[PDB]
TrEMBL record, chains A, B:
SUPFAM superfamilies assigned: Thioesterase/thiol ester dehydrase-isomerase
Name the record gives this protein: MaoC-like dehydratase
Annotated GO MF terms: (3R)-hydroxyacyl-[acyl-carrier-protein] dehydratase activity
GO biological process: fatty acid biosynthetic process
Source organism (scientific name): Mycobacteroides abscessus (strain ATCC 19977 / DSM 44196 / CCUG 20993 / CIP 104536 / JCM 13569 / NCTC 13031 / TMC 1543 / L948) (Mycobacterium abscessus)
Domain FAS1-like dehydratase: 6-133
């Protein structure tokens, strides 16, 4: 009976208008200084009508839209932790886009005593085209899996936010998926890259304040990312970075190498160990990558992206699918 | 020689485009649910072309613009704390406004061993009209006034943010100040209020998570608002709420009573004791107010606003100047 509500679907009445300053703010929060996120003229030189949203920006409106799904529709868990994400950038989102967002409970799988819950959001522009698909997998955590009174401390610490079940499913209809094939990407020539090419390693540092800033900018209320006492009560070794933040750092690493955040068509990240962010040292995340495959017909490729901190892998398998020039 | 740089002036090259979703986000962060900040049709019924920015919203772009002033121009202090603010709402800011922002060092006064530094920001719309003036007073804190090593802990905790003196002053020119007299305000009739009328008291609660959210949404990097250990090192009893956040809560209290956030022309707040936000209890801020004066010629008035927590005043003298209907 875990599966009874799978398929549940709802749309948000209000679309989300992507704003230039909010785009810059999210880029700042993920330490992403690619000029296309900041400078409208640099974005225009790459063929974009406004500053480009960093790839993981969609996490921010999606989390707000998913409140009903995780608090009311999915029953049986006190809290959740992200384990895996897939970002499909059908076309890059730019400032000025106004996007209608929906939510669908796509699966609930039980593996090795953990319930893995996948929700999917789609973002549809004013022309009715699907510009982005986001697949979020979390593990559901029940009351008995955390210290007694941990949830009461969590509820007490969380910010103040004012807001019989009937299943609804996605209506029938055809999807018009956006594409970006007309825009030449600002990436290396396909002829200048080779399978097996390794990316130069980059270290990104995170402080407690980076996580506090991200909590507000992305609207993530969970105190495990900013209260050491609650993080330990939840069974963690210390405060940990938001999974979405580390994925955003990976996308920034990748676009610093590639030259064009919009040239990515798909970013898939399995998470492994959490990135611990201590008060004394912060975190030091080492990113790397290696070209896995190239397709000369489409002049595209797949690049593995790696992420480690203090001897442990932060990412399991993670890949970028990207258009070359 | 404290006074040598007073008058220093600079403008930001890049204007700030006020976005609908960022307006809603700031309103959420200050627990302000007045419909004109959220619902474009409700704003339109009050005569506004888009959702209205909460009055203290200007604090967010102003702090970013003031970075150079406080880090490079004003010399001699390691950190600052807000003591007083004046918000002049020449006309209400709405989503869609694009605002050019400047900074001026207006005074540095020394009283009872504290240096009180006042900077002023103006916000000018695309028609060249001044829509908002913000006056920020802070006390400058020198190295020897805080525990040894406190500043090193502060610097370590702060988020990662990538960016010979020559004095420049404000160029000569006339100011075109915006006004809003053509828009009838959504406040009580002037004939239905009286000097001495008291406002019903309202309690607003703040948790640690409210402050974490505000830190990110408003771009305030100071860890005294979210790290108890650093707050104590800085000589405070515990984590304290941002002064701007408490002022925003006061404006929300006032517009819940008045019915129209845009009807305020001036909000002046002296701060007194900090609002302590403990892990166990948070803060409980009690707001009140009392009509001080009424002018039947303009149908305007001045209302004192009060704010207290746990037996201590959080606001010293604070006033709202408001248009009645």
């Amino acid at each position: 009976a875990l599966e009874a509500r799978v398929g549940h679907y709802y749309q948000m009445d209000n679309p989300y208008l992507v704003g230039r300053e909010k785009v810059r703010e999210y880029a700042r929060a993920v330490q992403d200084y690619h000029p296309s996120h900041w400078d409208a003229a640099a974005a225009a030189d790459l063929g974009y009508s406004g500053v480009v949203a960093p790839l993981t920006f969609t996490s921010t409106p999606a989390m707000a839209c998913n409140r009903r799904m995780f608090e009311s529709v999915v029953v049986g868990y006190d809290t959740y932790l992200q384990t895996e994400e897939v970002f499909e950038q059908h076309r890059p989102i730019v400032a000025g886009d106004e996007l209608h967002i929906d939510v669908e409970l796509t699966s609930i799988r039980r593996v090795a005593g953990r319930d893995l819950i996948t929700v999917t959001n789609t973002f549809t522009d004013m022309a009715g085209e699907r510009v982005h698909t986001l697949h979020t997998t979390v593990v559901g955590i029940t009351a008995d899996e955390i210290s007694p009174g941990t949830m009461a401390a969590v509820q007490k610490a969380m910010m103040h936010d004012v807001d019989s079940y009937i299943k609804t499913v996605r209506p029938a209809g055809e999807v018009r998926v956006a594409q970006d094939t007309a825009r030449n990407p600002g990436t290396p020539s396909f002829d200048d890259v080779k399978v097996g090419d390794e990316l130069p390693v980059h270290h990104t540092r995170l402080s407690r304040g980076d996580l506090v800033n991200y909590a507000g900018v992305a609207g993530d209320a969970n105190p495990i990312h900013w209260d050491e006492e609650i993080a330990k009560l939840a069974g963690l070794p210390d405060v940990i970075a938001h999974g979405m933040l580390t994925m955003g750092l990976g996308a920034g690493f990748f676009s610093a190498w590639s030259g064009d955040p919009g040239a990515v068509t798909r970013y898939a990240v399995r998470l492994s160990a959490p990135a611990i962010v201590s008060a004394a040292e912060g975190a030091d995340i080492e990113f790397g990558g290696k070209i896995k495959s190239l397709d000369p017909q489409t002049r595209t490729g797949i690049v593995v992206v790696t992420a480690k901190a203090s001897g442990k892998k932060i990412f399991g398998l993670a890949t970028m699918s990207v258009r070359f020039s």
